UniProtKB/Swiss-Prot annotation:
Entry-linked PANTHER family: TETRAACYLDISACCHARIDE 4'-KINASE, TETRAACYLDISACCHARIDE 4'-KINASE, MITOCHONDRIAL-RELATED
Role: Transfers the gamma-phosphate of ATP to the 4'-position of a tetraacyldisaccharide 1-phosphate intermediate (termed DS-1-P) to form tetraacyldisaccharide 1,4'-bis-phosphate (lipid IVA).
Family: Belongs to the LpxK family.
Gene Ontology annotations for the cellular component aspect, listed alphabetically: plasma membrane
Superkingdom to which the source organism belongs: Bacteria
Catalytic activity field: a lipid A disaccharide + ATP = a lipid IVA + ADP + H(+)
Pfam family, one: LpxK
Keywords: ATP-binding, Kinase, Lipid A biosynthesis, Lipid biosynthesis, Lipid metabolism, Nucleotide-binding, Transferase
Entry protein name: Tetraacyldisaccharide 4'-kinase
Length: 315
């Protein structure tokens, strides 16, 4: 009965969140405008809702534009505004960038990535140094201080039954779905679901494509043919990763579980063996040419309307 014990904090947190949102709604707090288009990707949950996949998909749609991701870079022990990546060129290590913005830069070698708590300041720096044509906020639904021309909200079925922090995982009450210009329905593979709001709505799917090597280049799945791999990941990821490796038919001779906080500073792989791990782990192991991650293609069902919305923000 522990969870219900946190409900009083949830109701309190609701008042705090609703007040802030009301101030934004009614024009009491400033909303700043960058002089090029801004697309926000977001979610209502503190848990994952497929954002990295959707940013990959979104960047691919925008492959003919100069793209810059504006990330919070929340973890990082350093602060201020920081260029992590210039169109694929990493400017800092993962330690300094934080895991997540560094990983996004590796997953998207054609886009820039800027880490900045204040997204607007991030954009200004990018404008001066990188001359991008469009910004993507990878987690910007609540960052209402920055105007976005297209507000995309990711929603998984589980969100619809959740409750506010700290009793549940929601950062905001479900009514705030109203702020979205478009919904992307995620986690379809494990929990398929429909949701009608009248808003433009798109189901997202992932499909296995290839391995990623330690340099994050795409390499064929073929190399696993008649090989048994050693797989490893952080403590929590162990579950999802295992299930996925099995359903893909990947032969695993041994699995290893490390703590979620591992910098792999003591990791010693065996020459001649092939390793599979998560992209979040892979970033700490570049150079090891026998360590790979799985790469998935990202697709949106009936995407045409989404493309139209994106097209129209460049006027
Ligand atoms: N299309 C993809 N190909 C390869 N790796 C991916 C892809 N999309 C995401 N990843 C990596 O795999 C992890 C799991 O993906 P998934 O979307 O199931 O989890 P999530 O926690 O909802 O995602 P996120 O970390 O973006 O919030 C992500 O955290 C990211 O590191």
């Amino acid at each position: 009965m522990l969870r219900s014990s946190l409900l009083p904090f949830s109701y309190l947190y609701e008042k705090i969140i609703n007040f802030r949102n009301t101030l934004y709604d009614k024009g009491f707090l400033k909303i700043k405008k960058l002089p090029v288009p801004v697309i926000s990707v977001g979610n209502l949950s503190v848990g994952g809702s497929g954002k990295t996949s959707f940013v990959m998909y979104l960047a691919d749609l925008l492959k003919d534009k100069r793209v810059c991701i504006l990330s919070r870079g929340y973890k990082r022990k350093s602060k201020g505004t920081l260029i992590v990546s210039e169109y694929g060129n990493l400017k800092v290590s993962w330690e300094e960038a934080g895991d997540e913005p560094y990983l996004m830069a590796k997953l998207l070698p054609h886009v820039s990535v800027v880490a900045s708590e204040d997204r607007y300041k991030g954009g200004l720096l990018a404008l001066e140094k990188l001359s991008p044509e469009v910004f993507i906020l990878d987690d910007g639904f609540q960052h209402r201080k920055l105007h976005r021309d297209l507000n995309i909200l990711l929603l998984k079925k589980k969100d619809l039954k959740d409750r506010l922090l700290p009793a549940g995982n929601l950062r905001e009450p479900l009514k705030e779905i109203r702020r979205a210009d478009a919904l992307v329905l995620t986690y379809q593979e494990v929990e398929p679901f429909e949701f009608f709001t009248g808003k433009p709505t798109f189901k997202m799917f992932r499909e296995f494509c290839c391995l990623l090597n330690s340099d994050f280049e795409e390499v064929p799945f073929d190399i696993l043919k008649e090989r048994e791999v050693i797989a490893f990941s952080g403590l929590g990821d162990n579950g999802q990763f295992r299930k996925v490796l099995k359903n893909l038919g990947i032969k695993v001779k041994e699995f290893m579980s490390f703590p979620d906080h591992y910098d792999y500073s003591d990791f010693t792989p065996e020459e001649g063996e092939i390793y599979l791990t998560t992209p979040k782990d892979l970033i700490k192991l570049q150079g090891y040419e026998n360590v790979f991650a799985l790469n998935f293609k990202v697709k949106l069902e009936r995407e045409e309307k989404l493309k139209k919305l994106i097209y129209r923000i460049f006027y």
